[PDB]
């Protein structure tokens, strides 16, 4: 069996995923994008899970909570954004979420990690602070919750941009066992970008998307930084104070990795956390598709937590949860690319830029039958474009069968590096119609593990749906 990135099937769009192991299964609790979506998080919340010892087998557990279950949202006019789920000290499962830019944290509850969740309440002040009202201060946003090893419960939230009233950083408070009532007014624990100036956090301040995990006895607080495309971490010995800046864990364009400035893949917001599954640690994040920020898909990479507690930045890959490189036999969707750029790939996220519409991008097209019949492919491939995959175990590979279409007149080169300097083969591209076709490209690749890159040079545009390995 094999698994790639994204780990859920290509017709599923679960960004903002919080990974938790419950009763032997790794559940992912994210928001819910739609293919071709026109706004953030348009679907009801679902969950998917794999056995914790076999992360290559994900199954769909259904919708677990709907937009209209919150009393603030009777017509479902507002979306539900990035959630978190904790097993509370009472043994039940508590789901925390905010409606789209609504300044309250809602809470639902179930006895099962797969639902059904029923509305529980809104996070609120105790009777003696602010008349016990619903918490609406310091911009409630992107909630994350920890049920600690001793049974205490801590909430983390906030929205702190640098670009009404917003957060100065990540805010935090301990909740009572009702899972609604804070023990005290929330306080800041990680500085936002503004307050980050002068600190070790400088340039990587808190922006959104906290995720709290226990690593041994330590508290690891991940967040999406002011850069938005990266996930950073801070570490403390205490849950609500004393956080020291860690570093970057993952960027969805590998920005920052080895000082890289030009992204390897279209940048966008990023959300997620770490999890211990098997004997290893993973980071879950999401990627962008469709040339927008509204069709996002969960990905993951193994990480290493060093003996001193630090977590070096990891590169994005196509094999993610596979536990090793993929087989260089059989057929693959082009949509599992972890490298995807052209001459318009932006260094600064800007989804208003009209160049996004005509940029190289992964898209989906509904087809007769099930979602598994839907076509995924890369469109808008022109000269200067590069498409890349990590990693394959090449054994006796003689050729590649590329399924393409379009009106392109030029050269498709094949290489093992993104700079296209380790060239292993190439094809003349003579297609000026509009029906799919397979092109065999002979390649001289020595056996062993390699990345795989396709580079296009010339005029026209092409679309790329699948590639297959031709072995001896
Ligand atoms: Ca879906
Ligand atoms: Ca979250």
Residue 363 contacts by C-beta under 8 Å, 6 or more apart in sequence?
36, 289, 290, 291, 376, 377, 378, 379
Whose atoms come closest to the Cα of 16: which ligand? 2
| Residue 26: Cβ-neighbour burial (10 angstroms; 0-12, 13-18, 19+) | buried
Options 12, 16, 18, 142, the catalytic residue: 16
Integer Cα distance of 448 and 443 in angstroms:
14
How many angstroms separate the alpha carbon of residue 295 from the centre of ligand 1?
10
Whose atoms come closest to the Cα of 17: which ligand? 2
Integer Cα distance of 438 and 469 in angstroms:
12
How many angstroms separate the alpha carbon of residue 145 from the centre of ligand 2?
9
**What's 112's DSSP letter?**
S
Integer Cα distance of 308 and 282 in angstroms:
18
**CA dist 183 → 162, 177, 178 (Å):** 30, 10, 11
Residue 287 contacts by C-beta under 8 Å, 6 or more apart in sequence?
5, 6, 252, 265, 268, 296, 297, 299, 316
Q: What are the beta bridge partners of residue 412?
A: 427, 456
Element (DSSP H or E) covering residue 286: strand 280-287
Give the total residue count for the chain: 472
Whose atoms come closest to the Cα of 284: which ligand? 2
Q: Is the bond into 143 cis (omega within 30 degrees of 0)?
A: no
Q: How far is CA 141 from the centre of its chain?
A: 18
Whose atoms come closest to the Cα of 19: which ligand? 2
How many angstroms separate the alpha carbon of residue 15 from the centre of ligand 2?
10
Question: Contact at 8 Å (CB) between 393 and 325?
Answer: yes
Integer Cα distance of 91 and 294 in angstroms:
35
Q: What is Dmax (Cα atoms) for the chain?
A: 76
State the method: X-ray
Question: Contact at 8 Å (CB) between 298 and 13?
Answer: no
Angle (CA) 89-93-96 rounded to 5° is 105
Q: What are the beta bridge partners of residue 459?
A: 409
Question: Contact at 8 Å (CB) between 157 and 210?
Answer: yes
Q: Active site includes 16?
A: yes
How many angstroms separate the alpha carbon of residue 43 from the centre of ligand 1?
7
Element (DSSP H or E) covering residue 361: strand 361-365
Integer Cα distance of 42 and 295 in angstroms:
10
Whose atoms come closest to the Cα of 6: which ligand? 1
How many angstroms separate the alpha carbon of residue 233 from the centre of ligand 2?
14
How many angstroms separate the alpha carbon of residue 218 from the centre of ligand 1?
35
Name all domains of the chain by residue range, CATH numbers in brackets: 18-322 (2.115.10.20), 326-471 (2.60.120.260)
**CA dist 44 → 31, 47, 63, 307 (Å):** 8, 10, 6, 41
**CA dist 415 → 190, 252, 272, 438 (Å):** 43, 22, 32, 19
Question: Contact at 8 Å (CB) between 291 and 350?
Answer: no
For the chain, how are helix, strand and coil distributed in percent, rounded to 5?
A: 5, 45, 50
How many angstroms separate the alpha carbon of residue 286 from the centre of ligand 1?
14
How many angstroms separate the alpha carbon of residue 62 from the centre of ligand 1?
10
Determine the 3-state secondary structure of 257 from DSSP. Answer: helix
Question: Contact at 8 Å (CB) between 250 and 229?
Answer: no
Options 12, 79, 208, 230, the catalytic residue: 208
Question: Contact at 8 Å (CB) between 149 and 214?
Answer: yes
Residue 296 contacts by C-beta under 8 Å, 6 or more apart in sequence?
13, 15, 16, 33, 268, 286, 287, 288, 289
Determine the 3-state secondary structure of 25 from DSSP. Answer: strand
How many angstroms separate the alpha carbon of residue 203 from the centre of ligand 1?
35
- DSSP string for residues in 173-239: EEEPTTSSBBSS--EEEEEBHHHHTTSTTTTS-EEEEEEEEEETTEEEEEEEETTSSEEEEEEESSS
Integer Cα distance of 183 and 181 in angstroms:
7
Buried/exposed code over 72-84 (b: 16+ C-beta within 10 A; e: otherwise): ebeeeebbbbbbb
198 HSE (CA, 13 A, CB side): 3
Nearest of 303, 28, 273, 297 to residue 144 by alpha carbon: 273
233 HSE (CA, 13 A, CB side): 25
Integer Cα distance of 351 and 437 in angstroms:
33
Write the Ramachandran bin of 408: left for phi over 0, alpha for psi from -120 to 50, otherwise beta. beta
Between the two ends of the chain, the Cα-to-Cα distance in Å is: 22
**CA dist 22 → 91, 149, 219 (Å):** 11, 15, 20
Report resolution in angstroms.
Answer: 2.0
Nearest of 452, 435, 257, 463 to residue 360 by alpha carbon: 463
Question: Contact at 8 Å (CB) between 450 and 392?
Answer: yes
Q: Active site includes 463?
A: no
352 HSE (CA, 13 A, CB side): 0
**CA dist 318 → 34, 66, 123, 338, 377 (Å):** 22, 32, 39, 5, 15
């Amino acid at each position: 069996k094999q698994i790639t990135n994204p780990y859920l099937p290509l017709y599923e769009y679960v960004p903002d995923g919080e990974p938790h192991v419950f009763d032997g299964r790794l559940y992912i609790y994210g928001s819910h994008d739609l293919a071709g979506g026109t706004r953030y998080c348009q679907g009801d919340y679902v969950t998917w899970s794999a056995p914790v010892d076999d992360l290559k087998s994900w199954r769909y557990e259904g919708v677990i909570y709907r937009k209209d279950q919150d009393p603030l949202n009777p017509d479902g006019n507002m979306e539900m954004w990035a959630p978190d789920v904790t097993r509370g000290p009472d043994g039940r499962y508590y789901l925390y979420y905010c409606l789209s830019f609504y300044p309250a944290v809602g809470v639902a509850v179930s006895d099962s990690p797969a639902g059904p969740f029923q509305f529980h309440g809104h996070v609120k002040y105790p009777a003696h602070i602010q008349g016990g009202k619903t918490l609406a201060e310091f911009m409630p946003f992107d909630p994350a919750v920890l049920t600690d090893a001793d049974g205490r419960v801590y909430l983390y939230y906030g929205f702190s941009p640098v670009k009404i009233q917003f957060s100065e950083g990540c805010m935090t408070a301990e909740l009572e066992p009702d899972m609604l009532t804070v023990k005290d007014t929330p306080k800041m624990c990680v500085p936002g970008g503004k307050l980050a100036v002068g600190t070790p956090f400088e340039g990587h301040g808190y922006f959104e998307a906290p995720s709290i995990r226990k690593v041994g006895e330590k508290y690891y607080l991940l967040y999406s930084s002011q850069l938005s495309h990266e996930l950073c971490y801070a570490v403390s010995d205490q849950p609500m104070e004393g956080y020291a800046y860690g570093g970057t864990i993952v960027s969805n364009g590998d920005v920052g990795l080895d000082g890289r400035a030009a992204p390897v893949y279209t940048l966008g917001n990023n959300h997620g956390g770490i999890v211990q599954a098997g004997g290893d640690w993973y980071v879950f994040y999401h990627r962008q598709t469709h040339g927008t920020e509204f069709s996002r898909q969960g990905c993951a990479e193994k990480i290493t937590i060093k003996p001193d507690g630090s977590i070096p930045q990891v590169e994005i890959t196509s094999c993610g949860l596979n536990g090793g490189p993929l087989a260089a036999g059989g057929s693959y969707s082009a949509a599992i690319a972890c490298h995807l750029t052209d001459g318009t790939t932006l260094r600064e996220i800007d989804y208003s830029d009209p160049v996004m519409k005509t940029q190289i991008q992964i898209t989906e097209e509904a087809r007769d039958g099930g979602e598994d019949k839907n076509l995924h492919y890369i469109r808008q491939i022109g000269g200067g474009a590069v498409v890349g995959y990590k990693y394959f175990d090449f054994q006796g590979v003689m050729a590649l069968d590329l399924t393409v279409r379009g009106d392109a007149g030029g050269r498709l080169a094949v290489a093992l590096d993104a700079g296209m300097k380790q060239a292993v083969g190439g094809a003349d591209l003579a297609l000026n119609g509009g029906g799919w076709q397979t092109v065999r490209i002979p390649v001289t690749v020595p056996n062993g593990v390699h990345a795989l890159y396709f580079g296009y040079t010339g005029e026209g545009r092409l679309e790329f749906s699948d590639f297959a390995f031709v072995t001896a």
